Amino acid sequence: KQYIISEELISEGKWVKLEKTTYMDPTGKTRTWESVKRTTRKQTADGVAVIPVLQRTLHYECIVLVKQFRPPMGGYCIEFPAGLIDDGETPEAAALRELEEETGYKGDIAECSPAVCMDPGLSNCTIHIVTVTINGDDAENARPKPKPGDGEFVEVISLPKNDLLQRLDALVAEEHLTVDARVYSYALALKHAN
Amino acid sequence: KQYIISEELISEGKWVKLEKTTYMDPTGKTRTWESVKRTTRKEQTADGVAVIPVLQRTLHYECIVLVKQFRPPMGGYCIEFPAGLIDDGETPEAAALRELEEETGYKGDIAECSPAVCMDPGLSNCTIHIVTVTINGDDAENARPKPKPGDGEFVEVISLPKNDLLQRLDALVAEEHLTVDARVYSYALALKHA
Numbered sequence A: 001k002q003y004i005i006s007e008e009l010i011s012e013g014k015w016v017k018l019e020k021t022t023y024m025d026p027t028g029k030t031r032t033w034e035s036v037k038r039t040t041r042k043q044t045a046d047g048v049a050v051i052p053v054l055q056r057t058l059h060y061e062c063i064v065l066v067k068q069f070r071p072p073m074g075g076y077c078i079e080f081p082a083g084l085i086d087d088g089e090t091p092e093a094a095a096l097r098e099l100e101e102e103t104g105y106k107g108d109i110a111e112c113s114p115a116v117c118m119d120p121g122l123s124n125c126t127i128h129i130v131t132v133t134i135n136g137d138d139a140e141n142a143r144p145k146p147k148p149g150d151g152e153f154v155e156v157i158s159l160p161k162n163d164l165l166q167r168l169d170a171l172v173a174e175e176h177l178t179v180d181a182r183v184y185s186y187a188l189a190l191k192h193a194n
Numbered sequence B: 001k002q003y004i005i006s007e008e009l010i011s012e013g014k015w016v017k018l019e020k021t022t023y024m025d026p027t028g029k030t031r032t033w034e035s036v037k038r039t040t041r042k043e044q045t046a047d048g049v050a051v052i053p054v055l056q057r058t059l060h061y062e063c064i065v066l067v068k069q070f071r072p073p074m075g076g077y078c079i080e081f082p083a084g085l086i087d088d089g090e091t092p093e094a095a096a097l098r099e100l101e102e103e104t105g106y107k108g109d110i111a112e113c114s115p116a117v118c119m120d121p122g123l124s125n126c127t128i129h130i131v132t133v134t135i136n137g138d139d140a141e142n143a144r145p146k147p148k149p150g151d152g153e154f155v156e157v158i159s160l161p162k163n164d165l166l167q168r169l170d171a172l173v174a175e176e177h178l179t180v181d182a183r184v185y186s187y188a189l190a191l192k193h194a
């Protein structure tokens, strides 16, 4: 019933652009929506986000997260490891690559979501959510080597999966951080399950 | 270590703007970032709310109430938690219960309310509160719920069992062209992983 008629470029940067989208509403009435898009998409989605399950025997299972300064937020955020998919890269490969660069961990793919939207009222940004296990007892993950790209400055924070939401709330209460909505949602459902 | 040096408007629409953010990196080097922000945020603790609406009924499995809407940024239909922007002076809880009633017809009860969480912190400053709400589907108020859509709102309600949420979303995605929201997928994934 609803569909895009046209788009009008308002402003284009190097990495983001702002458009005015004209669309048909289900009554037959024409309407406008201010939308953001990345300039970098060519493949399945803009980015991957990695749910990294760190498994060590005789230890609680942890979810590995990253803390970074985020210029659009003006502050530090706690997030799933993540990045944009390179031209000609698969989402699985992007996930394992980003996880290694941001955490130094080498993991195995468990599952891969379809393209899911980040903020569909605002942008067309999509990611693949990629669940990865990390065998923390394997020699390669003994002393994990984070390989930042130029301009990345990433702290690794591993939290127990069993208490994830309480631990995130605690970091927020002490550290003045912002938790990512996908991280929080996952933490919530861990608590809400069964 | 890192902080914002300056924020330069690049282009301001009615609803969304693009800014050039100058910031200090942790090596002591000045860098820039293209950032998206809404123009609508006043004194609210966040831009918006998303509602995790748990529909409870005697002799029923618990459902998660979702909505399906055309999203002009995406050029297509998206399946999301019920959500909207917080009105000036409105609390996150009031916003959540109001949006839930507008979008689904259901009259909920507050369970919990997250801190402000970031939507896509590498792109925008946008934040939500994620508000968990239970819906007593045995109350006569919630018997034959009618959405009260606002001007230009066109919302379908989809309630799926919590105990099968990821597979049921996968089956909706296999049947038509639509995108599941990343927070919904994240929460469906945790329900599997727990």
Ligand SMILES: CC(=O)N1CCC[C@@H](C(N)=O)C1
Pocket: A032, A033, A034, A035, A121, B015, B016, B085
């Ligand atoms: C409620 C909302 O998100 N609004 C109103 C309609 C236009 C939208 C836009 N231009 O992006 C903003």
Ligand SMILES: CC(=O)N1CCC[C@@H](C(N)=O)C1
Pocket: A014, A015, A016, A084, B032, B033, B034, B035, B122, B123
């Ligand atoms: C790695 C990446 O996606 N970057 C490059 C640095 C500038 C950033 C921006 N302009 O939003 C985007």
Ligand SMILES: [Cl-]
Pocket: A053, A110, A131, A132, A133, B193
């Ligand atoms: Cl797993």
Ligand SMILES: [Mg+2]
Pocket: A081, A082, A083, A102
């Ligand atoms: Mg990253």
Ligand SMILES: [Mg+2]
Pocket: A082, A083, A098, A101, A102, A149, A152
């Ligand atoms: Mg990276």
Ligand SMILES: [Mg+2]
Pocket: B082, B083, B084, B103
């Ligand atoms: Mg809405």
Ligand SMILES: [Mg+2]
Pocket: B083, B084, B099, B102, B103, B153
């Ligand atoms: Mg609404």
